[PDB]
């Protein structure tokens, strides 16, 4: 809760903003509006675009690439809001930028932001952000 302090990941509670996979999430955690860690809630549309972060998992000491995806087509959930920005770069490095509504590719051209999922896609880190 010091907002300016270095963020400290945990691996025990995915609805909390300090859960290790949420290291560059911006919005709301989908598990709090009827989705789950890596699935969208009923009625929303899963975007195909993504943003990446290398998130350190304190459990096994490894850094994993989390390719976030938005669940779109609904007004924002309002449950479990979180903004983290580990390795987050400005908009002109959009692969690592998180203010962008990443709803591209969602079915029915859905473009409104409801919540974000945090699936792992790889094990790697970045020049600009490595453990």
């Amino acid at each position: 809760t010091d907002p300016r302090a270095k963020w400290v990941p945990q691996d025990n509670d995915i609805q909390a903003c300090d859960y290790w996979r949420h290291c560059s999430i911006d919005g709301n955690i989908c598990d709090c509006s009827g989705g789950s860690l890596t699935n969208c809630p009923p009625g929303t549309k899963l975007a195909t675009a993504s943003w990446v972060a290398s998130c350190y998992n304190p459990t096994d000491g490894q850094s994993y690439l989390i390719a976030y995806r938005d669940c779109c087509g609904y007004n924002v959930s309002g449950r479990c809001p979180c903004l983290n920005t580990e390795g987050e770069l400005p908009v002109y490095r959009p692969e690592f930028a998180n203010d962008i509504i990443w709803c591209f590719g969602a079915e029915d051209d859905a473009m409104t932001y409801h919540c974000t999922i945090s699936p792992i896609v790889g094990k790697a880190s970045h020049h600009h952000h490595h453990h």
């Binding site: 890596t38 195909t48 675009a49 993504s50 943003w51 990446v52 994993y64 690439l65 390719a67 692969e95 690592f96 591209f104 590719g105 079915e107 699936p119 792992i120 896609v121 790889g122 094990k123 790697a124 970045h126 020049h127």
Partner: protein
């Protein structure tokens, strides 16, 4: 024994006595110096290969044998997507079932029948010794057992580490043994954030142990006919390659025009690209995906011809949900993708990158 089986397959693989006129072996078309693909220029360039009769050309491009051993046997998954198998249309279940097919194919090695294969095997005292040690006395006198054994040996050989060494720059970087350049790391980031990872990665999520940059699924990405290859193939201007629907037992019309997602390992040194070899340059292969995303007039034009890409050979079943991603690849991201895909080249082929 596993070693002996594969070593017998190594012998068969370069043996032209498995072709009717003894002009060609597996290795002729899957040349180990070219990541097990075909360097020979025929009537349609390198798009399609010439068979043992020195004239027949196929209608599809010769794929690498590297990493083909990682592909699961053909099956339909619980979401009703077909996966796995061998050949661009998955018509073989696995490497054993595939190995016999070029031997008997009149447009390839052209042996008339299994008996003719068994006779050529029996002619070689080394094969009598090697096959008998592994399959029992008289195996070569029974054409069915001989041909099945030859297929088993070849499939064993293709499952050795020499075909799947996992020693590319990408493998080294994932082992923490070196780092991508900035351009290669940008390229990897583009690959995993744009639509490519929807089809060219083994898993939906988690970490793959032996990634080969394909999910083994079948997709119609809407490629045009390769006119010169289709001419060379002799299949007729009237022919349509229906991809997976051509596999016996597949009847579902939604499979028409879908082909197996290729592994991108060694892609940089196995041009030309796609199931019909239609694009010679890796950059053109990448740019083709911009036809579904960019609104620039140039996105409609094949840069290798300066003319429109051409209508899809098969109009229907295009993977539009995945392809129409809403984001185009500018030239910087194309450069980054080329750089990334070059890192998937096996160490022994790095000198081909040039």
């Amino acid at each position: 024994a596993d070693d002996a089986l594969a070593a017998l397959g190594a012998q068969l693989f370069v043996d032209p006595a498995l072709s009717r006129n003894a002009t060609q072996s597996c290795a002729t078309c899957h040349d180990p110096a070219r990541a097990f693909t075909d360097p020979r220029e025929g009537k349609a360039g390198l798009a399609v290969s010439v068979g043992d009769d020195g004239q027949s050309h196929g209608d599809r491009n010769t794929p690498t044998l590297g990493y083909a051993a990682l592909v699961p046997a053909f099956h339909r998954d619980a979401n009703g997507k077909y996966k796995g198998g061998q050949f661009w249309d998955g018509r073989a279940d696995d490497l054993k079932q595939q190995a016999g097919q070029p031997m008997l194919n009149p447009v390839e090695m052209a042996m008339p029948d299994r008996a003719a294969v068994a006779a050529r095997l029996r002619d070689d005292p080394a094969y009598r010794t090697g096959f008998e040690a592994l399959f029992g006395k008289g195996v070569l006198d029974d054409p069915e057992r001989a041909f099945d054994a030859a297929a088993e040996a070849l499939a064993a050989y293709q499952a050795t580490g020499e075909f799947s060494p996992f020693d590319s720059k990408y493998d080294r970087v994932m082992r923490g043994e070196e780092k991508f350049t900035p351009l290669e790391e940008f390229g990897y980031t583009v690959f995993i954030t744009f639509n490519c990872r929807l089809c060219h990665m083994q898993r939906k999520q988690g970490v793959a142990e032996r990634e080969t940059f394909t999910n083994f699924e079948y997709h119609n990405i809407g490629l045009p006919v390769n006119e010169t290859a289709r001419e060379a193939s002799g299949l007729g201007a009237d022919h349509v390659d229906h991809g997976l629907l051509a596999r016996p037992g597949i009847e579902d019309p939604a499979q028409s025009g879908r082909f197996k997602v290729p592994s991108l390992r060694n892609v940089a040194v196995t041009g030309p690209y796609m199931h019909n070899g239609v694009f010679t340059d890796l950059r053109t292969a990448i740019l083709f995906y911009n036809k579904y995303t960019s609104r620039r007039p140039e996105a409609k034009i094949n840069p290798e011809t300066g003319a429109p890409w051409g209508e899809p050979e098969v109009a229907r079943n295009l993977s539009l949900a995945e392809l129409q991603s809403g984001l185009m690849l500018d030239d910087g991201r194309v450069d980054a993708l080329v750089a990334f895909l070059e890192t998937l080249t096996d160490r022994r082929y790095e000198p081909l990158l040039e």
